[PDB]
Ligand binder design. Sequence first.
Ligand code: A1AVJ
Lengths: 333, 334
Amino acid sequence: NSPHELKNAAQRAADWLVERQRPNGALPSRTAVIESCYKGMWALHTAGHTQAASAVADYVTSLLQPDGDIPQPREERYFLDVHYLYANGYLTIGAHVLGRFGLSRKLMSFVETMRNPATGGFRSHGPAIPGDGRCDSVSTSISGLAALYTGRVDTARSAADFLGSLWVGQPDRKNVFHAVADASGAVLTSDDAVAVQVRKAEGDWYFIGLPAFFLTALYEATEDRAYLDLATDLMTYMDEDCDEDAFVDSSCGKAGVAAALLYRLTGRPRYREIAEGIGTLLCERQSPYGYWSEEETGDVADLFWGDLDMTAEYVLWLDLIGRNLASGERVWA
Amino acid sequence: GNSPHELKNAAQRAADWLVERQRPNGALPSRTAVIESCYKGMWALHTAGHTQAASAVADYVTSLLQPDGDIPQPREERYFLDVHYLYANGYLTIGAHVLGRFGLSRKLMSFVETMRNPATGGFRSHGPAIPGDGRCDSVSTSISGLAALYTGRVDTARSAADFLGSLWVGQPDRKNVFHAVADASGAVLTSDDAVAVQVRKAEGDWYFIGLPAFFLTALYEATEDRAYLDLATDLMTYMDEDCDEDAFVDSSCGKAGVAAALLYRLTGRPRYREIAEGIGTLLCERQSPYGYWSEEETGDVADLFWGDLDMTAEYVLWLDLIGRNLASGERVWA
Ligand SMILES: *[C@@H](O)[C@H](NC(C)=O)[C@@H](O)[C@H]1O[C@H](O[C@H]2[C@H](O)[C@@H](O)[C@H](N)C[C@@H]2N)[C@H](N)C[C@@H]1O
């Protein structure tokens, strides 16, 4: 598919969401949880549905606590002790791009209270959830990206330092990507820490793909080739050392965005190929009705939270892939 | 008046009109290749969902970017040389940043900061290649402050607000004229060569007041410092009660309309809803059947005079911002 076609798919999905948005601004999830709609502000704004995006901001604002967190409603364990701040990161970006500067300042200030100042990582478990202070690549990358959008570039550079340390410290990168470090900054290989089985088709690739996207954006912001080189290390790892599932699994969109940005910035044709392939696959999986769903077909009035999240996520990724491929073609051809 | 949905529909048709005519290099369809024809394009088109077109404008803008972070050329209109040079740079910075073109936004914003007066917080009216006396005006300062808020440079925004407060307090004859320019020391400039708004006449340039009102409201949203809300409030009251009706009718009234819509969302004051609704309806009613805006052009044209291309992108942005703040304000307060 062409960049225009990727965007057409994103717009059909955004229209589907907006048609079913609730009066208070919540998106049509079968459970009322923040993990169903945290990407909604940014995705809907990207699609030009700024009134719907602002309505999500109104809903988010009504859940905001005095410390700047949204601790509830949350049910999915990945949003409790694996990467709690994954929700907060997209909320911060979406609020900021909408110009909701009070919301973005309060959300980002809370995010920063969970940063480990010695390692640059962001803690995996939220304030109400007990934990050992471990920090993971997804919490850290999304918090770094939110830092870029809010202008906290020092925080973003520190997040990149953590990701570099995590990458250098891998004990067996050919077989496993250990996505977590302890509070001292050493890679956590324990049974209970997220680990991508890179030679199996078992998903979780965004623990590598989201760092690759963030580091590429940080390179764009700073021109520091250390970040480009880490991003390309991660992309080459996914392309050459990881299972084919890395560019096929539902979580491959992050890598697709990173590849499209890398193509615009470097012109290397393999990055265009990776991005085009991922964009086309996501486009092919879209329901004729406009949403994306693991298991459901037909004309549903709402979705389970994970499918609703995936639908907003693919609005964002197809848009970002499409615009970076379009501009890359202009710049390099 | 018209509903938020109707305001957005007008914005979308104008954005479609622009994208249909965008050139392969990303330039918008201006009869003259000048930065003042498309400086609002990245932000306006992104707000309309036309992100590939917005990124194409970013590509065009990037092709003009100089090593110091400025776009000194192509520029032809005097207002973009020695009245408010940075007016172009400010929207370019915002549009680049919201698109995530972080290298472009950092470079642009870093140049903007070189024209800041560190004693007063104002921003110089004339660019590096344009000889001048160091005067600073309300529009250069407000747009640079707004760009500072989008890029997270909040201290720079606060300093811009300080300048605006000094400019307001220092007015020598506010019932008859708003002098929008200060000297390099911050004293209000009353010479004939310095922008003045004849507030009891219907002669335009109201955005020298309206843009400060919008920026200060956004700064209040960002900080909750009531000093900024109070100054924005005072400027809106000035426009509503001491200025000619033209302040909410002239082609430049969109800035005040956006400020009113945001103030309504933040405070719930009904007068701000009324001001924003009336301005939004007026701009909607002035749109051509084709999609563009122009006070003179009436034909099915393939391009526009630079000022009408700028106005068209500007009203895409203002109708979007008015609409979303009115809709959210209704949800919160009504
Ligand atoms: C990245 O945002 C993930 N999004 C998608 C569409 O995968 C993330 O929101 C999501 O990932 C986890 O669950 C995924 C898993 O990583 C995939 O490999 C699997 N094919 C599907 C599953 N939804 C995480 N448990 C929950 C997150 O919502």
